[PDB]
Every structure is written in structure tokens, then in C-alpha cells.
């Protein structure tokens, strides 16, 4: 099979800067009919992939002229002359010259922006849930940059790994921020034993951990 090696895997770029993504094929990719079927795709968060560039260098219908493609042999490049907010997502190269047709591993374009501190909110179990015998405590950490953040849960100070579930949104197109949710799941009986529940967050923006909590 033709291996398609895509670099870099992660591409942080400022709005308006140039960006280029490289795709290296392990063999030449000229089809028997003469065409080099090298395509570039963008997959925006939540969407199907969309074609940007076909036969190496041809812009697909409706694609902005800031995108362009080049290369030959085993070396191909996608260039974005100036990156816009809507360009964020994962870019893939694809060869359809030799069966089996194959994709690159993907390049995640990330938009650089100024540091933004998370808005942290903590939520006790609902009365509805408690009636049913469970107890989840939810913590939202919203609209922060950069993406790396650490959350820790304390129940009356004792550190809790068990039953902590974390989830992150993809980069937000409108302000280039990330969001995170962290849910601590307990039994109602265990929840009813303690008073103090703490959602603790460390992020580049603050040297002192961001602490939100409540009392039962």
C-alpha cells in the first residue's frame, strides 16, 4: 500500500499567517491513465470532509483562492496564504492512484490567540438525580486558551480519581477558545456523607489554582 505521511500532525498558526502542510507518499502516485490523484480535504469539527484541492493543484468549486496545492513525485504541499478562523479543523491528503486508496494521518490546524482564563462553574446533584439514587457533580471550565488545563476534584480535601469523567470541545470557530466539562460521579449514599465538594483547575493564565466549590 502507498503510505501517506503527513506533517506536521499539529499546526498552530496566527490568524492571517501563512500555513503549509506536507504530504510524502512512500511510492509515486501516477495512475495508469496519467493523472496524479492527490487530493486535499478539510474536515471541520462535526462535519464530513470537504474537498479543497484535486489532481495536486486544482482548486475545487467554491474553494477560496487562499488555498493552493503543489508537488510531484512523492512530495506534495497544501498552502494557505493567509489563515482564517473558518480554516480550523483537520486536513488530510489522499491518493487515489494505486489501490488501495489511502489517506494521510491528518493535520490539526489550531488558531493561536491571546491567553484567556476559564470561566469555572460548579453544579450540585439535581434533586431529580438524588431521588433516583445517584449523585453527579458537574464542573464546566469554559472559553479558555491555550487548550492545556488540569482539573482536580476534592471531597472534604481527599483527592478523587474514581468516577471523574472529563470531556473537551474542539476549538471554537468564533473566538478560538476551548471548553471542558468535568463530572464527578458518586453514589447518593457517599454524596450524603460529605459536605465539601471542590472543582480545582490549573491553567497557564493563573499560577494559583482556580477553585470553585459548594456545601451540601
Amino acid at each position: 500500500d502507498v503510505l501517506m505521511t503527513q506533517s506536521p500532525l499539529s499546526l498552530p498558526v496566527s490568524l492571517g499567517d501563512q500555513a503549509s502542510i506536507s504530504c510524502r507518499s512512500s511510492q509515486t502516485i501516477v495512475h495508469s491513465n496519467g493523472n496524479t490523484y492527490l487530493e486535499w480535504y478539510l474536515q471541520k469539527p462535526g462535519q464530513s470532509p470537504k474537498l479543497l484541492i484535486y489532481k495536486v493543484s486544482n482548486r475545487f468549486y467554491g474553494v477560496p483562492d487562499r488555498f493552493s496545492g503543489s508537488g510531484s513525485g512523492t512530495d506534495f504541499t497544501l498552502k494557505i496564504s493567509r489563515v482564517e478562523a473558518e480554516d480550523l479543523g483537520v486536513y488530510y491528503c489522499f491518493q487515489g492512484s494505486h489501490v488501495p486508496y489511502t489517506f494521510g494521518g491528518g493535520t490539526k490546524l489550531e488558531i493561536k490567540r491571546a491567553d484567556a482564563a476559564p470561566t469555572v462553574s460548579i453544579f450540585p446533584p439535581s434533586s431529580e438525580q438524588l431521588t433516583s439514587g445517584g449523585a453527579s457533580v458537574v464542573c464546566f471550565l469554559n472559553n479558555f486558551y491555550p487548550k492545556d488545563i488540569n482539573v482536580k476534584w476534592k471531597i472534604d480535601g481527599s483527592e478523587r480519581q474514581n468516577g471523574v469523567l472529563n470531556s473537551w470541545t474542539d476549538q471554537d470557530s468564533k473566538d478560538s477558545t476551548y471548553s471542558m466539562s468535568s463530572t464527578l460521579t458518586l453514589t447518593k449514599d457517599e454524596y450524603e456523607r460529605h459536605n465539601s465538594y471542590t472543582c480545582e483547575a490549573t491553567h497557564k493564565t493563573s499560577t494559583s489554582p482556580i477553585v470553585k466549590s459548594f456545601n451540601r
Binding site: 470532509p49 468549486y61 464546566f140 470531556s167
Partner: protein, 213 residues
């Protein structure tokens, strides 16, 4: 416009087969080939096969022994069948047109999310998330469902801005997610805020008003 409309199951038992129908509008299947591609977190994007305009096929040899693609040109339908699915065949399956030369019909179907698992279909529990005692963040916890997906909206779509619906994660072999909404502190509880959760797999539709305390 060009549209590729897929239909197929969301949940498949291990060792059972997966059948998807792709209905094409906007171009002739007598003229253009249609491809099948899947996407998984484990294996990325994988091309599975193609059915060319005259009906010949090429398949990916890693799948050929259990894969069939056939079509009916007069109904503009393409039929994908893969047998003996394992848990790691869990993926979004797409029909598409790609690898174009001179035409402009390079479009993808919406995708069919297929979970391969013996676990039973389970509805979500939907719980309102209100604060404990400038802007105020509210939420919905959508807990303990199977399989993916659900959809979440706030006041039936009217709250778009300041919403974050988080990817589902697995706990106790079921999915849990949350969604947050951020409205101005003046506006709540004075104006109502409600999440609308749908989980088609279990015929669940729940509306949960977020009430204080």
C-alpha cells in the same frame, strides 16, 4: 445540488453484518463512480472500496473477504455490505464521490455512525443543572445512554451563542454528556431556559426546564 443520503443501522451485534444504502441526487451513477470510506479514532480515515459507473469494483484487500458493493443505477442507489463486524469496526461510514478528474461532483454523504457492541439500547437520564446558592451558566446532564448519538438544543434552538455540548464519554459501559449555556444574569430565572434532549435509538425526547435552587 448534489446530495448523498445514507440509511443504515446505528447498532450492530458483533459478528453480524452492516448494510447501508446511499441514495444519490444531482449526478448519474451511469457516469460516475461512488466510493466508501470510514473514519474511526483507532484507525483514522480508511478507504474501503469503489463501484465504477459500469459496475466493476475495486476493494481494499484488508476488507475484500467480507465487503460487497453493488448498485441500481435507475434508482440512484448504492448498496454497501460488510460482514462479520467486530467492536473495532465501530466507525462513521461514508459514501462519497472523490478522486475526480474532470467533473465537479465531489461530495460526501452525511455519514452513518455504526457502533458494534452486544450492549443493549438504553435511554438517557436528563438532569437540569442549576447553580447552588454578570453572566450565569446553566446546564443539562445527559447520563447513561447507549448507543450514540443524542442531540441537545437550548430553548429549542433560540439559544445558540454561548452553548457548549461536550463529546460523550463512557462510564459503566454507557455514555454520559453535558451541555452548558451562558445567559446574562439579568435574564434568568426571569426568562425560561430549557434543554431539549433527543435520543432516537430509545425513542426518547425530553425537555428539562432549569429551575433555581
Amino acid at each position: 445540488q448534489v446530495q448523498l443520503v445514507e440509511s443504515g443501522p446505528g447498532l450492530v451485534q458483533p459478528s453480524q453484518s452492516l448494510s447501508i444504502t446511499c441514495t444519490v441526487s444531482g449526478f448519474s451513477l451511469s457516469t460516475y463512480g461512488v466510493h466508501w470510506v470510514r473514519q474511526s479514532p483507532g484507525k483514522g480515515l480508511e478507504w474501503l472500496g469503489v463501484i465504477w459507473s459500469g459496475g466493476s469494483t475495486d476493494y481494499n484487500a484488508a476488507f475484500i473477504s467480507r465487503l460487497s458493493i453493488t448498485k441500481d443505477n435507475s434508482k440512484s442507489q448504492v448498496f454497501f455490505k460488510m460482514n462479520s463486524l467486530q467492536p473495532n469496526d465501530t466507525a462513521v461510514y461514508y459514501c462519497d464521490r472523490m478522486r475526480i478528474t474532470t467533473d465537479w461532483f465531489a461530495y460526501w454523504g452525511q455519514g452513518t455512525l455504526v457502533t458494534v457492541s452486544a450492549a443493549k439500547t438504553t435511554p438517557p437520564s436528563v438532569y437540569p443543572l442549576a447553580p447552588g446558592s454578570s453572566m450565569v451558566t446553566l446546564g443539562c446532564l445527559v447520563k447513561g445512554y447507549f448507543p450514540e448519538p443524542v442531540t441537545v438544543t437550548w430553548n429549542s434552538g433560540s439559544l445558540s451563542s454561548g452553548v457548549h455540548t461536550f463529546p460523550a464519554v463512557l462510564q459503566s459501559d454507557l455514555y454520559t454528556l453535558s451541555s452548558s449555556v451562558t445567559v446574562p444574569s439579568s435574564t434568568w430565572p426571569s426568562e425560561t431556559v430549557t434543554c431539549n434532549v433527543a435520543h432516537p435509538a430509545s425513542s426518547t425526547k425530553v425537555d428539562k426546564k432549569i429551575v433555581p435552587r
